Amino acid sequence: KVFGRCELAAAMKRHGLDNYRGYSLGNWVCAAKFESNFNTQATNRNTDGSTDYGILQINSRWWCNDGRTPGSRNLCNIPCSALLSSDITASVNCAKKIVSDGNGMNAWVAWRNRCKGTDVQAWIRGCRL
Numbered sequence: 001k002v003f004g005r006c007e008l009a010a011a012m013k014r015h016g017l018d019n020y021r022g023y024s025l026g027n028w029v030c031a032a033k034f035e036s037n038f039n040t041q042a043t044n045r046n047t048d049g050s051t052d053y054g055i056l057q058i059n060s061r062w063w064c065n066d067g068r069t070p071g072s073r074n075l076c077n078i079p080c081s082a083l084l085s086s087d088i089t090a091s092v093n094c095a096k097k098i099v100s101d102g103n104g105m106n107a108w109v110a111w112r113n114r115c116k117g118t119d120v121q122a123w124i125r126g127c128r129l
């Protein structure tokens, strides 16, 4: 599913990402835009042989099982396939695990390079929330 900007802010707010660990909703919407282009079905293979899955491009080296990343972890205890759903529940719950893990939203390179120290509030400007 490809989300609209305000559609995804509301689903993200609904699922409790607004100011989760002090990260305003703008940050999660900004990060989704540049990780996935708001496409739940996004998959991208990494040089290391792991794969990034879904709206927030969660990686199979640590967070999910795709059965093809040898000696990797499944710290969110999900099939990576779960992260491609129209329902973003699995991606959000795993994202809470990742952002809590010591580096916050710096775990998303696109967030650190494109959203961090920017006016992320612009990402929720206009929306009914």
Ligand SMILES: CC(=O)N[C@@H]1[C@@H](O)[C@H](O)[C@@H](CO)O[C@@H]1O
Binding pocket: 046, 052, 056, 057, 058, 059, 063, 098, 107, 108, 109, 110
């Ligand atoms: C929190 C998380 O898994 N984010 C991933 C990151 O791990 C991975 O290195 C990158 C691919 O280059 O995609 C996303 O940024």
Ligand SMILES: [Cl-]
Binding pocket: 005, 033
């Ligand atoms: Cl947009």
Ligand SMILES: [Cl-]
Binding pocket: 024, 025, 026, 027, 120, 121, 122, 124
């Ligand atoms: Cl914001």
Ligand SMILES: [Cl-]
Binding pocket: 065, 066, 067, 068, 069, 070, 071, 072
């Ligand atoms: Cl594996």
Ligand SMILES: [Cl-]
Binding pocket: 011, 086, 087, 088, 089
């Ligand atoms: Cl949803």
Ligand SMILES: [Cl-]
Binding pocket: 021, 103, 104, 105
């Ligand atoms: Cl933090």
Ligand code: NA
Binding pocket: 060, 061, 062, 063, 064, 065, 066, 067, 069, 072, 073, 074
């Ligand atoms: Na894995």
